[PDB]
Write a protein that binds this ligand. Structure first.
Ligand SMILES: [Mg+2]
Ligand SMILES: [Mg+2]
Ligand SMILES: [Mg+2]
Ligand SMILES: [Mg+2]
Ligand SMILES: [Mg+2]
Ligand SMILES: [Mg+2]
Ligand SMILES: [Mg+2]
Ligand SMILES: [Mg+2]
Ligand SMILES: [Mg+2]
Ligand SMILES: [Mg+2]
Ligand SMILES: [Mg+2]
Ligand SMILES: [Mg+2]
Ligand SMILES: [Mg+2]
Ligand SMILES: [Mg+2]
Ligand SMILES: [Mg+2]
Ligand SMILES: [Mg+2]
Ligand SMILES: [Mg+2]
Lengths: 86, 34, 125, 45, 203, 154, 58, 233
RNA sequence: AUAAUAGUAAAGAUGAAAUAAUAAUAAUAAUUAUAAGACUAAUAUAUGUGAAAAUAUUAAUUAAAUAUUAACUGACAUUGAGGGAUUAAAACUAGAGUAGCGAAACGGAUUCGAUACCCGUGUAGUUCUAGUAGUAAACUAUGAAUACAAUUAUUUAUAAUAUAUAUAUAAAUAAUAAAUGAAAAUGAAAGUAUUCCACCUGAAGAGUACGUUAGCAAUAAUGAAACUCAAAACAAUAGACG
């Protein structure tokens, strides 16, 4: 998917963070947009390694299968984690 | 196996190889069509 | 993926040596940016003499202009950039090498790290 | 969460320290004794 | 307890170090605790260490690192030259003062740097020294010129009115043989713990 | 378990060989019982519960918070330059577990080789499990318990 | 259980904080970074035309 | 080396001989050895306290004994890897004896290098006989040195005049310095007095040193000339 | 290897010599300039890494990998007949490639002889791509797993210490104690124990024959008996010998 990020980031959260930073700076446009674009490019999946994508897939699988929030090691979740790698 | 003992085995293996070399045409004749 | 580059460009013209280098830097930087990439730094290095008389196809070179380009890209993009470098007649030696971002995000060029400055923030300050 | 964790522990430690106080606290509420105290503390917080 | 006694006792008192006994670099102050015997105790090879020390050693003083090693020998060197340097310095009687405008450290978390002097001189600068002949203004000390001058267990910077050719140029690099007199002006002490003396050649 | 028991026996033997005084063992029920039996017969000088790091001075209750780090400390015994607990061969091995009736145990006690067991010796102790309770073989005979012939100490 | 939940969540939070800090640092840096053509050209001019700070050792 | 049975079982072996009639007469030692038996119990005995510090060797801190949060704010809810490993070798290997005074000693000689040059006799006189009140530094049987300072610091710490260790150390150092200065002045003035009243010292320390240097130089010179000649040829 | 330059009679080889695509058609050596394959100097210790075969010029991609913490699962483990996959060098089947090396072959020496050791031409082969095959002193001649036992010295990593100290852990490597052992010696295993698999039961005949399966083939696995001996083998000892 098109605006998915690596390194355990989320695009919606990143934009919000950037906005908050901007607000803080103001308290204390084109260029800013360009910087934001550069950041997105850096943190995009499609520029990053396959390893990050796999990790993300594993995390997703865990989220799906976990019989409660903490579960890692549920036989089913372990199997799911194995599957992505396989 | 010491080396001395091995040498008898080696010799035997060589003899066997020689026999096989000798009986190549004979073996071929025996093999085909029966 | 942060890839460092080291290209040793040709210097045919005696009086104005850096022009070919500058053109190379422009072109490869343009390619990078067209292909989802982000060039971070373009560190120049001097008009340094080569160790031996290094030769390209039907040419010979004894002095060259050296530079680092420290850019982000995909792997396929990087590979293609490398291929384009290998192809062109105005570079003697090219070398892309990965800079690992598993620990940090801001990473300076190899030279800057050797000097002392780990991140580009330090260089800025 | 951290504050909650702290409160239960600190109260329990205080209860352990004072025996006379502990019995009175238990009466007010309503190894086994220690467990009951702990349960009461949990209910409170 | 035994442990307390051990902690008190004279081997525990010697502060441990694994610095080289042979150090060919620059020596600005003592490295190791000098350890003497009495003559009687030397006679029956006892130094108050783990083991007996070889009968080949006839000097009463020594320096050591390890009470016992894997090689089954105490790591020592039979020499206590540093005490003699200190005693020479005392005899010379030139009081060490900080050339920088600072209070004397002996008057009034941890600082490992050298507190004033290292304890080669606890002398104070204000005294004069009378004799039968009179009050000594200029301290006369014999030393050797190297090329700097070796003056009583210390190397010292030297100055003069005119460079004497007769003594110097007759034996250019055998100046160490002939002992010359010196007038020691003052002794300063730097951060590294080196005593920077300054002498004047007399003739 | 029986493998565990064999391991502890081997450990005891090792400790006897080099002359250590005080030795740790795993904290299980069977193991504890065995240790108690040895103590009562007179092979161990001491028996006490404790941590993985050492024997415990005061009482510490064992829970899921502790259990993994818990341990059974055991004092060994020597006299006239000879260890008391020389051997700890077990009889019922994990692969060939043997369970005798009372008659067979009696025969063993009275110098009869049974099921390829050398019959029990002058200063020996054959331990016997009977309804998850380790006993002396003589004790088991007296009570009349058909049981698993566990192990053998000398 | 509560303690274990806290331990799980605290570490995750710390990691998140670290990631945010890293992002902030990147943003601070990124005026020097290049995406557009004009910026790249300016960088080139700075590097080459000035004839200053060529990385050569002596 | 195996534990030898035959060094300690001597009387038993002789008792057997006596019983047999191999020995007609009993040895002189036989009755004595019977009266006073050997140990014959060559065990590795475990130790539970470090004697110097007074740290406990055997015990393990539990999860329940550590209720509050750790550095980096994580509550210990499980035994760690090291809490599961059977730490028996610690009970048996002899303890490394540590003292607070050792660090102070190390500090002192770093601060005062030339205190090392003051020679130290290590051959003990009766350790039981001494009786030093560390109210003051100058004890009688003991000389003035860094040790005395350190003892004074320890005394101060004990008495809680200076609650902090560093302050007590400084105080002890300052006490020492005055004494040292006094000692220095004593010797110089004694020398002056001697000079005044017509005392005659044949060899002064500096003169002695010069003489010592001279012999070495003479040795060097002859050797050096030979070496130069060798080099030439 | 080819070509050019200038230059002069030997060059190359060996124990010493010759034969040869050596050289008065102008070489060899030298300096240049093209091409071609195949190899990877130091670092290097195969340290380490890999299941084992293996694996050290550089880079990139994808895969797998260590430790400690936190949380979770709750005995899910061990071993493993049959089975499966990978498996040096040589060999083979295709299609490229072929510098150097080099079975065979031919020639020169050596020698009484020389189907050799040395030298010269040098084909298969060695190289790549796609396969076949599944053996080696495939060796640590030592199957895997777990619990345990006395020291020292080296490194390596981890934690604390008030970044550079002396400490606690592990891990490996080297000396040993005990123990074991026919001894040599093994040394956290060849020790103390437990579990599981493989395999051995005198020497010859024989890993041969017959049979079967598999392979393009060479072959690989499986694997007898008759006949004949009181032999046959290992560690160590003291000689003699080189
Ligand atoms: Mg064999
Ligand atoms: Mg293996
Ligand atoms: Mg190499
Ligand atoms: Mg190979
Ligand atoms: Mg092949
Ligand atoms: Mg072919
Ligand atoms: Mg040939
Ligand atoms: Mg295959
Ligand atoms: Mg074969
Ligand atoms: Mg085989
Ligand atoms: Mg091999
Ligand atoms: Mg032995
Ligand atoms: Mg055995
Ligand atoms: Mg054997
Ligand atoms: Mg060995
Ligand atoms: Mg058949
Ligand atoms: Mg076969």
């Amino acid at each position: 998917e098109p605006l998915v990020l690596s390194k355990g980031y989320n695009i919606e959260e990143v934009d919000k963070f950037l906005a908050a930073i901007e607000s803080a700076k103001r308290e204390r446009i084109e260029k800013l947009e360009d910087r934001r674009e550069a950041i997105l490019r850096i943190l995009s999946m499609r520029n990053s390694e396959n390893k990050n994508a796999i990790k993300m897939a594993v995390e997703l699988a865990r989220k799906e299968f976990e019989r409660f929030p903490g579960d890692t090691g549920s036989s089913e979740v372990q199997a799911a984690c194995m599957t992505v790698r396989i | 196996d010491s080396v001395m003992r091995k040498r008898k085995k080696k010799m035997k293996k060589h003899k066997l190889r020689k026999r096989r070399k000798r009986e190549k045409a004979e073996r071929r004749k025996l093999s085909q069509g029966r | 993926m942060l890839y460092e580059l080291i290209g040793l460009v040709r210097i045919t013209n005696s009086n104005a040596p850096k022009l070919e280098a500058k053109e190379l830097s422009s072109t490869i930087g343009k390619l990078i940016i067209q292909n989802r990439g982000v060039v971070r730094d373009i560190v120049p290095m001097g008009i340094r003499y080569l160790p031996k008389i290094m030769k390209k196809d039907q040419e010979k070179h004894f002095r060259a202009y050296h530079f680092l380009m420290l850019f982000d890209s995909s792997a396929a993009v990087q590979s293609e950039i490398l291929r384009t470098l290998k192809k062109d007649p105005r570079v003697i030696r090219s070398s892309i090498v990965k800079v690992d971002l598993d620990k940090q995000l801001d990473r300076a060029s190899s030279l800057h790290r050797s000097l002392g400055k780990k991140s580009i923030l330090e260089l800025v300050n | 969460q951290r504050s909650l964790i702290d409160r239960i522990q600190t109260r329990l430690s205080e209860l352990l320290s004072n025996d006379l106080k502990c019995d009175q606290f238990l009466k007010d509420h309503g190894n086994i004794k220690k467990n009951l105290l702990r349960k009461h503390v949990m209910m409170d917080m | 307890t035994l442990a307390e006694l051990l902690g008190r006792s004279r081997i525990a008192q010697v502060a441990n170090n694994h610095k080289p006994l042979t150090y060919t670099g620059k020596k600005f102050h003592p490295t190791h605790q000098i350890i003497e015997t009495k003559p009687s105790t030397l006679y029956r090879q006892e130094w108050g260490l783990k083991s007996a020390i070889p009968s080949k050693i006839k000097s009463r003083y020594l320096v050591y690192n390890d009470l016992d090693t894997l090689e089954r020998i105490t790591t020592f060197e039979p020499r206590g030259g540093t005490q003699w340097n200190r005693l020479r310095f005392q005899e010379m009687g030139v009081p060490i003062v900080s050339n920088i405008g600072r209070q004397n450290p002996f008057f009034k978390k941890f600082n490992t740097e050298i507190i004033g002097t290292g304890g080669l001189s606890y002398s104070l600068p204000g005294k004069l020294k009378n004799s039968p002949n009179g009050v000594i203004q200029r301290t006369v000390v014999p030393g050797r010129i190297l090329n700097l001058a070796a003056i009583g267990g210390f190397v010292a910077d030297v100055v003069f009115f005119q460079s004497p050719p007769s003594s110097f140029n007759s034996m250019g690099d055998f100046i160490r043989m002939k002992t010359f007199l010196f007038e020691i002006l003052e002794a300063s002490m730097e951060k590294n713990g080196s005593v920077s003396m300054h002498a004047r050649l007399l003739e | 378990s029986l493998v565990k028991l064999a391991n502890t026996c081997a450990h005891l033997q090792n400790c006897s060989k080099v002359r250590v005084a005080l030795t740790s063992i795993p904290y299980t029920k069977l193991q504890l019982q065995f240790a108690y039996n040895l103590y009562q017969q007179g092979f161990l000088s001491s028996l006490q519960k404790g941590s993985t790091m050492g024997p415990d001075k005061d009482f510490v209750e064992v829970t899921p918070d502790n259990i993994s780090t818990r341990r059974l400390w055991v004092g060994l015994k020597y006299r006239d330059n000879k260890p008391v607990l020389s051997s700890c061969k077990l009889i019922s091995k994990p692969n060939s577990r043997i369970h005798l009736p009372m008659e067979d145990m009696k025969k063993l006690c009275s110098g009869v080789t049974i099921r390829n067991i050398k019959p029990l010796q002058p200063g020996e102790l054959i331990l016997v499990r009977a309804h998850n309770n380790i006993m002396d073989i003589n004790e088991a005979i007296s009570k009349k318990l058909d049981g698993e012939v566990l192990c053998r100490v000398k | 259980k509560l303690k274990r939940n806290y331990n799980r969540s605290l570490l995750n939070f710390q990691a998140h904080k670290k990631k945010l800090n890293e992002l902030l640092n990147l943003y601070h840096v990124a005026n020097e970074f290049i995406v557009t053509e004009s910026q790249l050209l300016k960088k080139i001019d700075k590097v080459f035309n000035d004839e200053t700070e060529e990385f050569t050792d002596a | 080396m195996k534990i030898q049975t035959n060094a300690v079982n001597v009387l038993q072996r002789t008792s057997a001989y006596l019983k047999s009639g191999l020995l007609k007469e009993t040895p002189a030692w036989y009755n004595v050895v019977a009266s006073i038996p050997p140990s014959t119990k060559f065990t590795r005995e475990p130790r539970f306290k470090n004697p110097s510090n007074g740290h406990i060797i055997g015990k393990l801190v539990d999860v329940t004994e550590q209720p509050h949060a750790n550095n980096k704010g994580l509550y210990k809810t499980r035994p760690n890897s090291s809490d599961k490993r059977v730490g028996v070798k610690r009970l048996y290997r002899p303890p490394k004896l540590t003292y607070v005074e050792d660090r102070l000693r190390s500090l002192f000689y770093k601060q005062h290098p030339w205190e090392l040059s003051r020679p130290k006799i290590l051959v003990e006189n009766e350790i039981g006989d001494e009786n030093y009140d560390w109210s003051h530094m100058l004890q009688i049987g003991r000389p003035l040195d860094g040790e005395s300072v350190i003892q004074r610091t320890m005394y101060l710490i004990k008495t809680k005049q200076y609650g902090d260790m560093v302050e007590a150390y400084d105080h002890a150092r300052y006490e020492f310095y005055a004494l040292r200065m006094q000692e220095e002045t004593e010797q110089q003035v004694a020398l002056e007095e001697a000079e005044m009243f017509g005392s005659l010292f044949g060899v002064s320390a500096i003169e002695h040193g010069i003489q010592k240097e001279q012999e070495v130089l003479d040795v060097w010179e002859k050797k050096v000339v030979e070496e130069t000649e060798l080099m030439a040829a």
